């Protein structure tokens, strides 16, 4: 389908309120964690499901990026629109945020303690992403 582009990207975040630089990695066991560099399981496939809404699937884990309660990120093999579809919003400064409408939270690599510490701040750490091309 050539109606919308299929993008292949690595997602990379250093902030806000971040410590190190992180590549979003979807491991085969479903865990979503920080990768210090570009790896096979940090390679993401990005396709539109609505106009500005996006689904994100790790190509080597073939797990969709899905959000749980309080904003926890997990990789599930079965897509569900309410948990794994996000509005992609590109900020004026060039960073991409992926808001979940159901959970009212952005995709982030914050820990569970960080997500609770910031749950009423209007932003989560490690939620501003730069989309990087893969180096063959």
């Amino acid at each position: 389908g050539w109606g919308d582009p299929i993008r292949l990207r690595h997602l990379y975040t250093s902030g806000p309120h971040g410590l190190s630089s992180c590549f979003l990695r979807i491991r085969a066991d479903g865990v979503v964690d920080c990768a210090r560099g570009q790896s096979a399981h940090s390679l993401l496939e990005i396709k539109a499901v609505a106009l500005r809404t996006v689904a994100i699937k790790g190509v080597h884990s073939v797990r969709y990026l899905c959000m749980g309660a309080d904003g926890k990120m997990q990789g599930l093999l079965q897509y569900s629109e309410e948990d794994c579809a996000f509005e992609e919003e590109i900020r004026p400064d060039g960073y991409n945020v992926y808001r979940s409408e159901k959970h009212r939270l952005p995709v982030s690599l914050s820990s569970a303690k960080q997500r609770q510490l910031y749950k009423n701040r209007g932003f989560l750490p490690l939620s501003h992403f730069l989309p990087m091309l893969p180096m063959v």
Partner: antibody, heavy 119, light 111 residues
Framework: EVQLLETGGGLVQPGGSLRLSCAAS????????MSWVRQAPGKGLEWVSA????????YYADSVKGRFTISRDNSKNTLYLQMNSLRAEDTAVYYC????????????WGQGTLVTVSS | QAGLTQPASVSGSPGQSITISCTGT?????????VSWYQQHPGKAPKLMIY???NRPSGVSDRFSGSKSGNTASLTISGLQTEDEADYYC??????????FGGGTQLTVLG
């Protein structure tokens, strides 16, 4: 590293036919879309046609629909553009371009093969 | 049914900064975030310099930056160096017309 070798360029008369081939090497050819982008001498770039990666989806520009045919064969890692009903406006260097995925964003380019349509 | 509009020529001296505009419509530059910029030196293949409006592939110098406002995308090259002299083509995604290009801009580094 990654290499795209276009072949089949030369002189053809208006109304003739010619098929271009692109020798892909250095990547899993079957996983990425491909495209042909052409450039008339001393003029700008024009995207010609696109292929899905598996062959199932093809995309064409208005200036070549019905006359050009994009095709692939993943066994031999080769991309095809069969140009029929050639006109003078098809005179261009024809570039073989690898898609980053299926987004019409071009990772790598061949050095192009020139197609001259003159009588 | 028309390509994107770029200025035919842009020129600056070494060390200066320049901007190349790329005007489209609400169906291309102003309708998506998939504006790309390519650099083409004489007799060579185009080279991807900017993708998705503002992002740089690895190796591309950080003197190149892309941005967009309404229907106009812009490529900016700070600290002009001699080798920056080339042709620059912007490109945008479209829903039903494939990849549409701009007419190209010849960048001259006045030496």
């Amino acid at each position: 590293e990654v290499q795209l070798l276009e072949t089949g360029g030369g002189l053809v008369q208006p109304g003739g036919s010619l098929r271009l081939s692109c020798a892909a090497s250095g990547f899993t050819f079957s996983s990425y879309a491909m495209s042909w982008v052409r450039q008339a001498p001393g003029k700008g770039l024009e995207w010609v046609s696109a292929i899905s990666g598996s062959g199932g989806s093809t995309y064409y520009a208005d200036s070549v629909k019905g006359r050009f045919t994009i095709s692939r064969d993943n066994s031999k890692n080769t991309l095809y553009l069969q140009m029929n009903s050639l006109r003078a406006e098809d005179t261009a260097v024809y570039y073989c371009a690898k898609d980053n995925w299926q987004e019409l964003l071009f990772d790598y380019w061949g050095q192009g093969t020139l197609v001259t349509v003159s009588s | 049914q028309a390509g994107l509009t770029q200025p035919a020529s842009v020129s600056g001296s070494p060390g200066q900064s320049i901007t190349i505009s790329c005007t489209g419509t609400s169906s291309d530059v102003g309708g998506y975030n998939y504006v790309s910029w390519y650099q083409q030196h004489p007799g060579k293949a185009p080279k991807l310099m900017i993708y998705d409006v503002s992002n740089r592939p690895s190796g591309v110098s950080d003197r190149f930056s892309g941005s967009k406002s309404g229907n106009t995308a812009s490529l900016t090259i700070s600290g002009l160096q001699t080798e920056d002299e080339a042709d620059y083509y912007c490109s945008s995604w479209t829903r039903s017309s494939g990849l549409v290009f701009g007419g190209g801009t010849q960048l001259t580094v006045l030496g």
